[PDB]
CSV table of C-alpha atoms and ligand atoms in Angstrom, one decimal:
chain,number,residue,atom,x,y,z
A,223,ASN,CA,-23.8,11.8,16.7
A,224,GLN,CA,-22.6,11.3,13.2
A,225,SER,CA,-25.7,12.9,11.6
A,226,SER,CA,-25.4,16.1,13.6
A,227,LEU,CA,-21.3,16.3,12.8
A,228,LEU,CA,-22.0,16.1,9.1
A,229,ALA,CA,-25.3,18.3,9.0
A,230,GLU,CA,-22.7,21.5,8.3
A,231,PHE,CA,-22.3,19.5,5.1
A,232,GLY,CA,-26.1,19.9,4.3
A,233,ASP,CA,-28.8,17.5,4.6
A,234,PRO,CA,-28.2,14.1,3.1
A,235,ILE,CA,-29.5,14.9,-0.5
A,236,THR,CA,-27.2,17.9,-0.4
A,237,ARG,CA,-24.3,15.9,0.6
A,238,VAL,CA,-24.7,13.6,-2.3
A,239,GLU,CA,-25.4,16.1,-5.0
A,240,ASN,CA,-22.2,18.4,-3.5
A,241,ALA,CA,-20.3,15.0,-3.8
A,242,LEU,CA,-21.4,14.4,-7.5
A,243,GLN,CA,-20.5,18.4,-8.7
A,244,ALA,CA,-17.2,17.9,-6.7
A,245,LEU,CA,-16.4,14.9,-8.9
A,246,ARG,CA,-17.5,16.6,-12.1
A,247,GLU,CA,-14.9,19.4,-11.0
A,248,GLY,CA,-12.3,17.1,-10.8
A,249,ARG,CA,-12.2,16.9,-7.2
A,250,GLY,CA,-11.8,14.3,-4.6
A,251,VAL,CA,-14.5,13.5,-2.0
A,252,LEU,CA,-14.9,11.7,1.3
A,253,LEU,CA,-16.7,8.8,1.8
A,254,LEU,CA,-17.7,7.2,5.4
A,255,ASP,CA,-19.2,3.8,5.2
A,256,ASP,CA,-21.6,2.7,8.3
A,257,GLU,CA,-20.5,2.8,11.7
A,258,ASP,CA,-21.2,-0.5,12.4
A,259,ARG,CA,-19.0,-1.9,9.7
A,260,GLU,CA,-15.6,-0.4,8.8
A,261,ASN,CA,-16.2,2.8,10.2
A,262,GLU,CA,-13.9,4.4,7.8
A,263,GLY,CA,-13.5,7.5,5.6
A,264,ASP,CA,-11.9,7.0,2.1
A,265,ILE,CA,-10.7,9.5,0.0
A,266,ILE,CA,-12.5,8.9,-3.7
A,267,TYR,CA,-11.0,10.7,-6.8
A,268,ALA,CA,-12.3,10.1,-10.5
A,269,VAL,CA,-10.2,8.2,-12.6
A,270,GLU,CA,-10.7,10.6,-15.5
A,271,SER,CA,-9.5,13.6,-14.0
A,272,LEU,CA,-6.9,11.8,-11.6
A,273,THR,CA,-3.5,14.2,-11.2
A,274,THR,CA,-0.3,13.2,-9.6
A,275,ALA,CA,-0.4,15.8,-7.0
A,276,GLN,CA,-4.3,14.1,-6.0
A,277,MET,CA,-2.3,10.9,-6.0
A,278,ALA,CA,0.6,12.1,-3.8
A,279,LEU,CA,-1.9,13.6,-1.3
A,280,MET,CA,-3.6,9.8,-1.1
A,281,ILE,CA,-0.3,8.4,-0.6
A,282,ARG,CA,0.7,10.9,2.1
A,283,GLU,CA,-2.2,10.9,4.2
A,284,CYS,CA,-4.0,7.6,3.4
A,285,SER,CA,-2.9,3.6,4.2
A,286,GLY,CA,-0.9,4.1,1.0
A,287,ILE,CA,-2.4,1.0,-0.2
A,288,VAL,CA,-4.5,2.7,-3.2
A,289,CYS,CA,-7.1,0.9,-4.7
A,290,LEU,CA,-8.7,1.1,-8.5
A,291,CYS,CA,-12.6,0.5,-8.1
A,292,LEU,CA,-13.7,-1.0,-11.3
A,293,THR,CA,-16.9,-2.1,-12.9
A,294,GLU,CA,-17.1,-6.0,-13.9
A,295,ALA,CA,-16.7,-5.0,-17.6
A,296,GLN,CA,-13.6,-3.4,-17.2
A,297,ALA,CA,-12.0,-5.9,-14.8
A,298,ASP,CA,-12.9,-8.6,-17.4
A,299,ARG,CA,-11.6,-6.7,-20.2
A,300,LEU,CA,-8.4,-6.4,-18.7
A,301,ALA,CA,-8.6,-9.9,-17.6
A,302,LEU,CA,-8.2,-9.3,-14.0
A,303,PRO,CA,-9.4,-12.3,-11.9
A,304,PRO,CA,-10.0,-12.3,-8.1
A,305,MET,CA,-6.6,-12.5,-6.4
A,306,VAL,CA,-7.6,-15.7,-4.3
A,307,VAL,CA,-10.1,-18.2,-5.9
A,308,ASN,CA,-11.8,-18.7,-2.3
A,309,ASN,CA,-12.2,-15.0,-0.6
A,310,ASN,CA,-12.0,-15.3,3.5
A,311,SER,CA,-11.6,-11.7,4.3
A,312,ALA,CA,-13.8,-10.2,6.4
A,313,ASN,CA,-15.9,-8.1,4.2
A,314,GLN,CA,-14.9,-9.8,1.2
A,315,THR,CA,-13.4,-7.0,-0.2
A,316,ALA,CA,-12.8,-7.8,-4.1
A,317,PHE,CA,-9.1,-7.4,-4.7
A,318,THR,CA,-8.3,-8.8,-8.1
A,319,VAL,CA,-4.6,-9.4,-8.8
A,320,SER,CA,-2.3,-6.5,-8.3
A,321,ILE,CA,-1.3,-4.7,-11.5
A,322,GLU,CA,1.6,-2.6,-12.9
A,323,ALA,CA,1.6,-0.5,-16.2
A,324,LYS,CA,3.8,-2.9,-18.4
A,325,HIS,CA,5.4,0.2,-20.3
A,326,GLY,CA,6.0,3.6,-18.8
A,327,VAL,CA,7.0,3.2,-15.1
A,328,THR,CA,10.0,2.2,-13.1
A,329,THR,CA,9.1,0.6,-9.7
A,330,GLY,CA,5.5,1.4,-9.9
A,331,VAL,CA,5.0,3.5,-6.6
A,332,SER,CA,5.6,6.8,-7.4
A,333,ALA,CA,2.9,9.0,-7.4
A,334,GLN,CA,3.4,9.4,-11.2
A,335,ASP,CA,4.1,5.6,-11.9
A,336,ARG,CA,0.8,4.7,-9.8
A,337,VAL,CA,-1.4,7.3,-12.2
A,338,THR,CA,0.1,5.9,-15.2
A,339,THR,CA,-0.9,2.6,-14.1
A,340,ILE,CA,-4.5,3.8,-13.0
A,341,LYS,CA,-4.6,5.4,-16.8
A,342,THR,CA,-3.6,2.7,-18.2
A,343,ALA,CA,-6.0,0.3,-16.5
A,344,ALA,CA,-8.9,2.7,-16.8
A,345,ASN,CA,-8.5,3.3,-21.0
A,346,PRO,CA,-11.8,2.0,-22.1
A,347,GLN,CA,-9.9,0.3,-25.1
A,348,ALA,CA,-7.1,-1.4,-22.9
A,349,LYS,CA,-5.6,-4.9,-23.3
A,350,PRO,CA,-4.7,-7.2,-20.4
A,351,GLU,CA,-1.3,-7.2,-21.9
A,352,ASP,CA,-1.2,-3.6,-21.3
A,353,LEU,CA,-0.7,-4.5,-17.4
A,354,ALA,CA,2.0,-6.2,-15.9
A,355,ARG,CA,1.0,-8.3,-12.8
A,356,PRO,CA,1.8,-8.7,-10.1
A,357,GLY,CA,2.1,-4.7,-9.2
A,358,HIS,CA,1.5,-1.9,-6.8
A,359,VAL,CA,-2.0,-0.6,-7.8
A,360,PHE,CA,-4.9,-2.8,-6.5
A,361,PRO,CA,-8.1,-3.3,-8.5
A,362,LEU,CA,-11.6,-4.0,-7.0
A,363,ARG,CA,-14.2,-5.4,-8.5
A,364,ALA,CA,-17.6,-3.5,-7.7
A,365,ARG,CA,-20.6,-5.4,-7.4
A,366,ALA,CA,-23.2,-5.3,-9.6
A,367,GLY,CA,-26.3,-3.3,-8.2
A,368,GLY,CA,-23.4,-1.1,-6.6
A,369,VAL,CA,-24.4,0.0,-2.8
A,370,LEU,CA,-28.0,-1.2,-3.2
A,371,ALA,CA,-25.9,-5.0,-3.4
A,372,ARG,CA,-22.9,-4.0,-1.1
A,373,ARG,CA,-22.4,-1.4,1.3
A,374,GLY,CA,-18.7,-1.0,0.8
A,375,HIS,CA,-16.4,1.8,-0.5
A,376,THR,CA,-16.0,0.1,-3.5
A,377,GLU,CA,-19.7,0.5,-4.6
A,378,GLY,CA,-20.0,3.7,-3.4
A,379,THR,CA,-16.9,4.5,-5.5
A,380,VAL,CA,-18.4,3.2,-8.9
A,381,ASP,CA,-21.8,4.5,-7.7
A,382,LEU,CA,-20.6,7.8,-7.4
A,383,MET,CA,-19.2,8.0,-10.9
A,384,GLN,CA,-22.2,6.8,-12.5
A,385,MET,CA,-24.2,9.1,-10.5
A,386,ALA,CA,-22.1,12.1,-11.6
A,387,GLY,CA,-22.4,11.0,-15.5
A,388,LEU,CA,-18.6,10.3,-15.2
A,389,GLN,CA,-16.7,7.1,-16.7
A,390,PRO,CA,-17.1,4.6,-13.9
A,391,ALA,CA,-13.5,4.1,-12.7
A,392,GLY,CA,-12.5,5.6,-9.3
A,393,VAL,CA,-9.6,5.4,-7.0
A,394,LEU,CA,-9.8,5.2,-3.2
A,395,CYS,CA,-7.8,4.9,0.0
A,396,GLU,CA,-8.6,4.9,3.7
A,397,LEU,CA,-7.6,8.0,5.6
A,398,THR,CA,-5.1,7.4,8.4
A,399,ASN,CA,-4.0,9.4,11.1
A,400,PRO,CA,-0.2,10.6,11.7
A,401,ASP,CA,-0.3,7.8,14.8
A,402,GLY,CA,-1.2,4.9,12.9
A,403,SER,CA,-5.2,4.9,13.8
A,404,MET,CA,-7.6,5.1,11.0
A,405,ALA,CA,-9.5,8.6,10.8
A,406,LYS,CA,-12.8,8.8,12.2
A,407,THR,CA,-15.7,11.1,11.7
A,408,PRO,CA,-14.2,14.2,13.2
A,409,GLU,CA,-10.9,13.8,11.1
A,410,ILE,CA,-12.7,13.0,8.4
A,411,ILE,CA,-14.8,16.2,8.7
A,412,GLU,CA,-11.4,18.2,9.6
A,413,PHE,CA,-9.9,16.7,6.3
A,414,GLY,CA,-12.6,17.8,4.2
A,415,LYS,CA,-12.7,21.5,5.2
A,416,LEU,CA,-8.9,21.4,4.6
A,417,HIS,CA,-8.9,20.3,1.1
A,418,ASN,CA,-12.4,21.4,-0.2
A,419,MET,CA,-13.8,17.6,-0.4
A,420,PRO,CA,-17.2,17.1,-0.1
A,421,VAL,CA,-18.1,14.3,3.2
A,422,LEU,CA,-20.8,12.0,2.7
A,423,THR,CA,-21.8,8.3,3.8
A,424,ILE,CA,-22.9,5.1,2.4
A,425,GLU,CA,-26.4,5.5,3.8
A,426,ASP,CA,-26.6,9.1,2.3
A,427,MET,CA,-26.0,7.2,-1.1
A,428,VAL,CA,-28.3,4.7,-0.5
A,429,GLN,CA,-31.1,6.9,0.5
A,430,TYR,CA,-30.6,9.0,-2.8
A,431,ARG,CA,-30.7,6.3,-5.0
A,432,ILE,CA,-33.8,5.1,-3.4
A,433,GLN,CA,-35.5,8.2,-3.3
A,434,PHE,CA,-34.7,8.6,-6.9
A,435,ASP,CA,-35.2,5.4,-8.1
A,436,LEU,CA,-32.0,5.4,-9.7
A,437,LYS,CA,-31.0,1.8,-11.6
A,438,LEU,CA,-27.1,2.5,-12.6
B,34,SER,CA,30.3,18.9,-8.6
B,35,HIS,CA,28.4,16.1,-7.2
B,36,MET,CA,30.0,13.4,-5.3
B,37,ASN,CA,28.7,9.7,-6.0
B,38,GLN,CA,26.4,7.7,-3.7
B,39,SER,CA,29.3,5.7,-2.4
B,40,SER,CA,31.0,9.3,-1.2
B,41,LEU,CA,27.5,10.6,0.2
B,42,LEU,CA,27.2,7.3,2.2
B,43,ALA,CA,31.0,7.5,3.4
B,44,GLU,CA,29.5,9.7,6.9
B,45,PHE,CA,28.1,6.3,7.8
B,46,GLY,CA,31.4,4.5,7.7
B,47,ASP,CA,33.2,2.1,5.0
B,48,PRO,CA,30.7,-0.8,3.4
B,49,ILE,CA,31.6,-3.3,6.2
B,50,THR,CA,30.6,-0.9,8.9
B,51,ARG,CA,27.8,0.3,7.3
B,52,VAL,CA,26.9,-3.4,7.4
B,53,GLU,CA,27.9,-3.8,11.3
B,54,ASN,CA,26.0,-0.5,12.3
B,55,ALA,CA,22.6,-2.0,10.2
B,56,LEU,CA,23.0,-5.3,12.2
B,57,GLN,CA,23.5,-3.6,15.3
B,58,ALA,CA,20.8,-1.2,15.0
B,59,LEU,CA,18.4,-4.1,14.3
B,60,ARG,CA,19.8,-5.6,17.4
B,61,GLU,CA,18.8,-3.0,19.1
B,62,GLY,CA,15.4,-3.3,17.8
B,63,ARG,CA,15.8,0.2,15.7
B,64,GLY,CA,15.2,0.8,11.8
B,65,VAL,CA,17.7,0.8,9.1
B,66,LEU,CA,17.3,2.1,5.1
B,67,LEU,CA,18.7,-0.2,2.5
B,68,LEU,CA,19.6,1.3,-0.7
B,69,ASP,CA,19.5,-1.1,-3.6
B,70,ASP,CA,21.8,-0.8,-7.0
B,71,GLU,CA,21.9,2.7,-8.3
B,72,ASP,CA,20.9,0.9,-12.0
B,73,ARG,CA,18.1,-1.2,-10.5
B,74,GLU,CA,15.2,0.7,-8.3
B,75,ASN,CA,17.9,3.1,-7.3
B,76,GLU,CA,15.6,3.6,-3.8
B,77,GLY,CA,15.7,3.5,-0.4
B,78,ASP,CA,13.4,0.9,1.9
B,79,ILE,CA,13.0,1.3,5.9
B,80,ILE,CA,13.5,-2.3,7.1
B,81,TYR,CA,12.3,-3.5,10.7
B,82,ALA,CA,12.9,-6.6,12.5
B,83,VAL,CA,9.7,-8.2,13.2
B,84,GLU,CA,10.7,-9.6,16.4
B,85,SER,CA,10.7,-6.1,18.0
B,86,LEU,CA,8.2,-4.2,15.8
B,87,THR,CA,6.0,-1.7,17.4
B,88,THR,CA,2.6,0.0,16.5
B,89,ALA,CA,4.8,3.7,16.0
B,90,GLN,CA,7.3,2.0,13.9
B,91,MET,CA,4.5,0.6,11.6
B,92,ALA,CA,2.8,4.1,11.5
B,93,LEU,CA,6.1,6.0,10.6
B,94,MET,CA,6.2,3.4,7.7
B,95,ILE,CA,2.6,4.6,6.9
B,96,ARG,CA,3.1,8.0,6.7
B,97,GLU,CA,6.8,8.0,5.5
B,98,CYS,CA,6.5,5.2,3.0
B,99,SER,CA,4.7,4.2,0.2
B,100,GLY,CA,2.4,2.6,2.6
B,101,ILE,CA,2.5,-0.8,0.6
B,102,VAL,CA,4.2,-2.5,3.5
B,103,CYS,CA,5.8,-5.8,3.0
B,104,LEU,CA,6.7,-8.8,4.9
B,105,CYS,CA,9.9,-10.4,3.8
B,106,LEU,CA,9.9,-14.5,4.6
B,107,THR,CA,11.7,-17.2,4.1
B,108,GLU,CA,10.7,-19.9,1.5
B,109,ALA,CA,10.5,-22.3,4.3
B,110,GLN,CA,8.1,-19.9,6.3
B,111,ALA,CA,6.0,-19.1,3.2
B,112,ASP,CA,5.5,-22.9,2.6
B,113,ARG,CA,4.6,-23.3,6.3
B,114,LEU,CA,1.6,-20.9,5.5
B,115,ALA,CA,0.6,-22.0,2.3
B,116,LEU,CA,1.4,-18.7,0.7
B,117,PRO,CA,1.6,-19.5,-2.9
B,118,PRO,CA,2.8,-16.8,-5.7
B,119,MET,CA,0.0,-14.4,-6.2
B,120,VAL,CA,0.9,-14.7,-9.9
B,121,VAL,CA,1.9,-18.1,-11.5
B,122,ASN,CA,3.6,-16.0,-14.2
B,123,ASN,CA,4.9,-13.1,-12.6
B,124,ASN,CA,6.0,-10.4,-15.4
B,125,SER,CA,6.9,-7.5,-12.9
B,126,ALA,CA,9.9,-5.3,-13.6
B,127,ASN,CA,11.8,-7.3,-10.8
B,128,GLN,CA,9.9,-10.4,-10.6
B,129,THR,CA,9.2,-8.9,-6.9
B,130,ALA,CA,7.7,-12.5,-5.1
B,131,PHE,CA,4.3,-11.1,-4.0
B,132,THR,CA,2.3,-14.0,-2.5
B,133,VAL,CA,-1.5,-13.5,-1.9
B,134,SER,CA,-2.2,-11.1,0.4
B,135,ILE,CA,-3.0,-11.8,4.3
B,136,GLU,CA,-4.9,-10.6,7.3
B,137,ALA,CA,-5.0,-11.6,10.8
B,138,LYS,CA,-8.1,-13.4,11.6
B,139,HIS,CA,-8.1,-12.4,15.5
B,140,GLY,CA,-7.2,-9.2,17.1
B,141,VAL,CA,-7.8,-7.1,14.2
B,142,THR,CA,-10.6,-5.0,12.7
B,143,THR,CA,-10.2,-3.7,9.1
B,144,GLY,CA,-6.8,-4.5,8.8
B,145,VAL,CA,-5.3,-1.4,7.8
B,146,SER,CA,-4.3,0.4,10.8
B,147,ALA,CA,-0.8,0.3,12.2
B,148,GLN,CA,-1.9,-2.0,15.3
B,149,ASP,CA,-3.7,-4.3,12.8
B,150,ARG,CA,-1.0,-4.6,10.3
B,151,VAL,CA,1.5,-5.0,13.3
B,152,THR,CA,-0.8,-8.1,14.5
B,153,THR,CA,-1.3,-9.6,11.0
B,154,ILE,CA,2.5,-9.1,10.5
B,155,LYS,CA,3.6,-11.1,14.2
B,156,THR,CA,0.9,-13.8,13.7
B,157,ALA,CA,2.2,-14.5,10.2
B,158,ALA,CA,6.0,-14.5,11.0
B,159,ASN,CA,5.4,-16.9,14.0
B,160,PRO,CA,7.4,-20.0,13.4
B,161,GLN,CA,4.6,-22.0,14.8
B,162,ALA,CA,2.1,-20.3,12.7
B,163,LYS,CA,-0.6,-22.2,10.7
B,164,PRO,CA,-2.1,-21.0,7.4
B,165,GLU,CA,-5.6,-21.0,8.9
B,166,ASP,CA,-4.1,-18.3,11.4
B,167,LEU,CA,-4.2,-15.9,8.2
B,168,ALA,CA,-7.2,-14.9,6.4
B,169,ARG,CA,-6.6,-14.0,2.4
B,170,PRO,CA,-6.5,-11.3,0.8
B,171,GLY,CA,-5.8,-8.6,3.0
B,172,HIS,CA,-3.7,-5.6,3.8
B,173,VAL,CA,-0.1,-7.1,4.5
B,174,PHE,CA,2.0,-8.5,1.7
B,175,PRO,CA,4.1,-11.0,2.0
B,176,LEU,CA,7.4,-11.7,-0.2
B,177,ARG,CA,9.4,-14.9,-0.5
B,178,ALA,CA,13.3,-14.2,-0.3
B,179,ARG,CA,15.2,-16.1,-2.5
B,180,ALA,CA,17.5,-18.7,-0.9
B,181,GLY,CA,20.9,-17.6,-0.8
B,182,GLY,CA,20.0,-13.7,0.1
B,183,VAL,CA,21.8,-11.0,-1.7
B,184,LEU,CA,24.5,-13.2,-2.9
B,185,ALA,CA,21.7,-15.1,-5.6
B,186,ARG,CA,19.3,-11.9,-5.9
B,187,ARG,CA,19.9,-8.4,-5.1
B,188,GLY,CA,16.4,-7.2,-4.2
B,189,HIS,CA,15.8,-5.3,-0.8
B,190,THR,CA,13.4,-8.6,-0.3
B,191,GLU,CA,17.0,-10.7,0.2
B,192,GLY,CA,18.3,-7.8,1.8
B,193,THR,CA,16.2,-7.6,4.8
B,194,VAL,CA,15.9,-11.5,5.5
B,195,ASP,CA,19.8,-11.6,5.2
B,196,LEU,CA,19.9,-8.9,7.7
B,197,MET,CA,17.8,-10.6,10.3
B,198,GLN,CA,19.8,-13.6,9.9
B,199,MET,CA,23.3,-11.9,10.0
B,200,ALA,CA,21.8,-10.1,13.1
B,201,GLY,CA,20.7,-13.7,14.8
B,202,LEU,CA,17.1,-12.4,15.0
B,203,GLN,CA,13.7,-13.8,13.6
B,204,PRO,CA,14.1,-14.1,10.1
B,205,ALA,CA,11.5,-12.1,9.0
B,206,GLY,CA,11.3,-8.3,8.7
B,207,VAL,CA,8.9,-5.2,7.5
B,208,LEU,CA,9.7,-3.1,4.0
B,209,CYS,CA,8.5,-0.3,2.7
B,210,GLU,CA,10.3,2.4,0.2
B,211,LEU,CA,10.7,5.9,1.3
B,212,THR,CA,8.5,8.4,-0.3
B,213,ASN,CA,8.8,12.0,-0.8
B,214,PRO,CA,5.6,14.4,0.3
B,215,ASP,CA,4.9,15.2,-3.3
B,216,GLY,CA,5.0,11.6,-4.4
B,217,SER,CA,8.5,11.2,-6.0
B,218,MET,CA,10.5,8.6,-4.3
B,219,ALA,CA,12.9,9.2,-2.0
B,220,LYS,CA,16.4,9.1,-3.0
B,221,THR,CA,19.9,9.1,-1.5
B,222,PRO,CA,20.1,12.6,0.0
B,223,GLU,CA,17.0,12.5,1.4
B,224,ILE,CA,17.3,8.6,2.6
B,225,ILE,CA,20.6,10.0,4.5
B,226,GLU,CA,18.7,12.8,5.9
B,227,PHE,CA,15.8,10.5,7.0
B,228,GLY,CA,18.1,8.2,8.3
B,229,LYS,CA,20.2,10.8,10.5
B,230,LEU,CA,16.9,12.1,12.0
B,231,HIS,CA,15.6,8.6,13.2
B,232,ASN,CA,18.7,7.1,14.1
B,233,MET,CA,18.6,4.6,11.3
B,234,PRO,CA,21.7,3.5,9.9
B,235,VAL,CA,22.0,3.5,5.7
B,236,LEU,CA,23.7,0.7,3.9
B,237,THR,CA,23.5,-0.5,0.4
B,238,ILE,CA,23.2,-4.0,-1.4
B,239,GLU,CA,26.3,-3.8,-2.4
B,240,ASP,CA,28.2,-3.0,1.0
B,241,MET,CA,25.8,-6.6,2.4
B,242,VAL,CA,27.5,-8.3,-0.9
B,243,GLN,CA,30.7,-7.3,0.2
B,244,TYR,CA,30.2,-8.1,3.6
B,245,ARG,CA,29.2,-11.5,3.0
B,246,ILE,CA,32.1,-12.1,0.7
B,247,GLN,CA,34.6,-10.6,3.1
B,248,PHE,CA,33.0,-12.3,6.1
B,249,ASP,CA,31.5,-15.7,4.9
B,250,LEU,CA,33.6,-17.0,2.0
B,251,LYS,CA,36.6,-18.9,2.4
C,1045,LIG,O1,-10.0,-2.6,2.6
C,1045,LIG,C1,-10.2,-1.3,2.1
C,1045,LIG,N1,-9.2,-1.5,1.0
C,1045,LIG,O2,-8.2,-1.9,0.9
C,1045,LIG,C2,-11.2,-0.6,1.9
C,1045,LIG,O3,-11.6,-0.8,2.9
C,1045,LIG,C3,-11.6,0.3,0.5
C,1045,LIG,O4,-12.3,1.1,1.0
C,1045,LIG,C4,-12.4,-0.8,-0.4
C,1045,LIG,O5,-13.1,-2.0,0.7
C,1045,LIG,P1,-14.7,-2.0,0.9
C,1045,LIG,O6,-15.3,-2.2,-0.3
C,1045,LIG,O7,-14.7,-3.2,1.7
C,1045,LIG,O8,-14.7,-0.6,1.5
C,1046,LIG,O1,8.5,-3.0,-4.8
C,1046,LIG,C1,8.5,-3.5,-3.6
C,1046,LIG,N1,7.7,-3.3,-2.7
C,1046,LIG,O2,6.3,-3.8,-3.3
C,1046,LIG,C2,10.1,-2.7,-2.9
C,1046,LIG,O3,11.0,-2.8,-4.1
C,1046,LIG,C3,10.5,-3.7,-2.2
C,1046,LIG,O4,11.8,-3.6,-1.8
C,1046,LIG,C4,10.8,-5.3,-2.4
C,1046,LIG,O5,11.1,-5.7,-3.9
C,1046,LIG,P1,12.3,-6.2,-4.1
C,1046,LIG,O6,12.9,-7.4,-3.2
C,1046,LIG,O7,12.3,-6.5,-5.5
C,1046,LIG,O8,13.6,-4.7,-4.3
C,1047,LIG,ZN1,-17.1,-10.7,-15.5
C,1048,LIG,ZN1,10.2,-2.2,-5.8
C,1049,LIG,ZN1,-13.8,0.5,2.8
C,1050,LIG,ZN1,36.0,-5.4,10.7
C,1051,LIG,ZN1,33.8,-6.1,12.1
C,1052,LIG,ZN1,34.2,-7.9,13.1
C,1053,LIG,ZN1,-11.5,-1.9,4.0
C,1054,LIG,ZN1,13.0,-3.2,-3.8
C,1055,LIG,ZN1,20.1,16.2,9.8
C,1056,LIG,ZN1,10.3,11.7,9.9
C,1057,LIG,ZN1,27.1,-15.1,6.9
């Protein structure tokens, strides 16, 4: 039972509030989506405080397909169209064209290079010409309305940033077991305890937003 | 004194021998580690043959490499799958030939597990595959190898397809950059140790070029 396992991280309101405070402190959090959706937990970091060490942990412990969650306005500013005109992926995951920093990286895949690319993209004064395409960082357009419009990790990421009062850009990647299977709730909980990362669910976020009448 | 890369690689044999051992590993369904030019990426990538690809091989790649696992295809196969370049005007440093990303439609869930990526890759590499067998976007990244292989473009992409063809295998391979725990990219000494521990031979693009020159040109 997921709610019973998660109980040690506090009740749902506490789980959200602890996640927001972690992010304000520059720490990562772990976000589980619905059991009947992906049933996956993603590491989430605020771009504002992103470090090479955080990126390195993500690469080593997750899928390695590290995504950059952006608002529609920031993706527009960067001139990042959807990768595909007609998306037919199972979840309609909103991949834009992939990106690299135009300057300041080599092959784009080291922890340092991915952070450079991500900081370059997230710069509120960025220009499209600041980014080469294609690249090794994968931006996602978060849906307007956040988790009340789409219950994906993309929306959970941007909603967490906004709720925490942070700049609305986050990085996201799926926690993966050494044998290649995807982490489920017990493994996610274990990882959170190891790395001082709050664990919460998308339903936690949805209930929180509903209760506190939160338009973002 | 630090010996150069060619000297560190001597324990794998002379350049032609390094290629021959790589071909045989692939025929035996084992992986290889391919280094490109020192003044290019100076990176080593794990390569696996698609035709013997296993979940455990993919899991290793996800754990020990960048996790951005690519599928190297011939232009003919990418065309058969209707996989256009991701970007019309590619201005990436190496002009790496990313197509739009892909996912299998059947036999997978979220597409990112080791098993799921293998399923996608097997689906895509099938010589009778059709465009509709693949959803786009997805979590596997196909690359269009240049006609002529390493004699035309000195990328890991061409290295991968060349090795498959020279080994007499299905002309499609899996490719990912070896990465250190601290997030830096693996360099030659680490690549060599990884190869020895995992029974994967190590070779360079220049080895492959010399091999093709000595074995093909007349
Ligand atoms: O597929 C993914 N990344 O590529 C993950 O699911 C990631 O969390 C983002 O996608 P999502 O918003 O559909 O959950
Ligand atoms: O960038 C990469 N993968 O995304 C790797 O370098 C991979 O080897 C393919 O690129 P390359 O053929 O330019 O070397
Ligand atoms: Zn827009
Ligand atoms: Zn590269
Ligand atoms: Zn997700
Ligand atoms: Zn010989
Ligand atoms: Zn010989
Ligand atoms: Zn011979
Ligand atoms: Zn997903
Ligand atoms: Zn390469
Ligand atoms: Zn050893
Ligand atoms: Zn190992
Ligand atoms: Zn030949």
